[PDB]
C-alpha cells in the first residue's frame, strides 16, 4: 500500500529532523540565557515557561487528530 | 534487515529535557497505534479465518482475547486484532484516560493503561513477523515494518513499558537490534 509507505517515510524523515531541531533549540536557549545574564532562579523560570509550550504543543498534536 | 533511513532512533525516543513523561508516552503511543493499524491494514487480505484460526506468534505462542475477571477467549487472528484495535482506539478517545483539555492531568493509573495498550500492540507485530512476513516482502514493505518495530522496541525499552517476558516471541529479532 502506497499511502502507508509515503506516510511512514515522511514520518521517519520528520521524526529525526524534529529531534535534532529540538536539541538545538534547547542549546540556543541556554546560550541566550547566559548572554542575557539571567540569574539562576530566572533561568529555572525561563526553562519551565518554554517547556510548558512544548508540552502544550505535544498535547494539541495528539488532540487535533 | 532493512530500515527507512540512517537516523538514530535511540536518541529520538528519549524524553526531551523538561518534557512531561506522561505526555511523551501518550503522543508516541497514538503514533504507534496509527502505524500498526496501517501496517496490518496492508496484509489484512492475507490474514483470514482459514490462514490463521488462532492468534499465533510462531508455534510457541497463542494469544487469547481478554480485556473484568472475564475468561479469555480463544479466537482467530483477524478477530483478536479487530477486538484489540477497537479497544485501544476507545482508550485513546477516552478523555478520562487521554485528556484533551489543556492543563488537565493524566489519571493516577496512566502508566498502567499505556503499558496495557503497548503490550497488546506488540502482539500485532509478533503475529505479522511470524505469520505474514512473506506478504510483507511481496509488498516490499520490509523497511517500513522493520523501522516501525525498531522504533517501537526502543521506545518501550527506554520507558520500561513492556517486560522482557512479554517481548519473548520476538527476542531474536530484538537482540539483532540490540
Ligand atoms: Zn494472520
Author numbering:
A (entry chain C): 21 to 85
B (entry chain A): 33 to 99, 102 to 212
Which lines from the publication concern this structure?
The Hippo pathway is vital for organ growth control and tissue homeostasis, and its dysregulation has been linked to various human cancers. Upon activation MST1/2 phosphorylates LATS1/2 and MOB1 to support formation of an active MOB1/LATS complex, which phosphorylates YAP/TAZ, promoting its cytoplasmic retention and/or degradation. Thus, the Hippo core pathway can act through distinct kinases, with MOB1 acting as a fundamental signal adaptor that can interact with the Hippo core kinases MST1/2, LATS1/2, and NDR1/216, 19–22. Biochemical evidence suggests that MOB1 can associate with the highly conserved N-terminal regulatory domain (NTR) of NDR/LATS kinases to promote their activities.
To delineate the interaction of MOB1 with NDR2 on the atomic level, we determined the crystal structure of the MOB1/NDR2 complex at 2.1 Å using purified MOB1 (residues 33–216) and the NTR of NDR2 (residues 25–88). The structure of MOB1 adopts a globular shape consisting of nine α-helices (α1–α9) and two β-strands, as reported for unbound human MOB119, 32, frog MOB133, and yeast Mob1p34. The central intermolecular interactions between MOB1 and NDR2 are hydrogen bonds and van der Waals interactions, with the two antiparallel α-helices of NDR2 representing two interaction interfaces. In the α1 helix Lys25, Leu28, Tyr32, Leu35, and Ile36 of NDR2 interact with Leu36, Gly39, Leu41, Ala44, Gln67, Met70, Leu71, Leu173, Gln174, and His185 of MOB1. In the α2 helix Arg42, Leu78, Arg79, and Arg82 of NDR2 interact with Glu51, Glu55, Trp56, Val59, Phe132, Pro133, Lys135, and Val138 of MOB1. MOB1(Q67A) and MOB1(H185A) mutants did not interact with NDR2, illustrating that the observed MOB1/NDR2 interaction is specific. Consequently, our structural comparison suggests that Asp63 of MOB1 specifically bonds with LATS kinases through His646, which is conserved in human LATS1/2 and fly Wts, but replaced by a bulky Phe/Tyr residue in human NDR1/2 and fly Trc. MOB1/NDR2 complex formation is dramatically increased by prior MST1/2 phosphorylation of MOB1, while the MOB1/LATS1 interaction appears to be fully dependent on MST1/2 phosphorylation of MOB1.
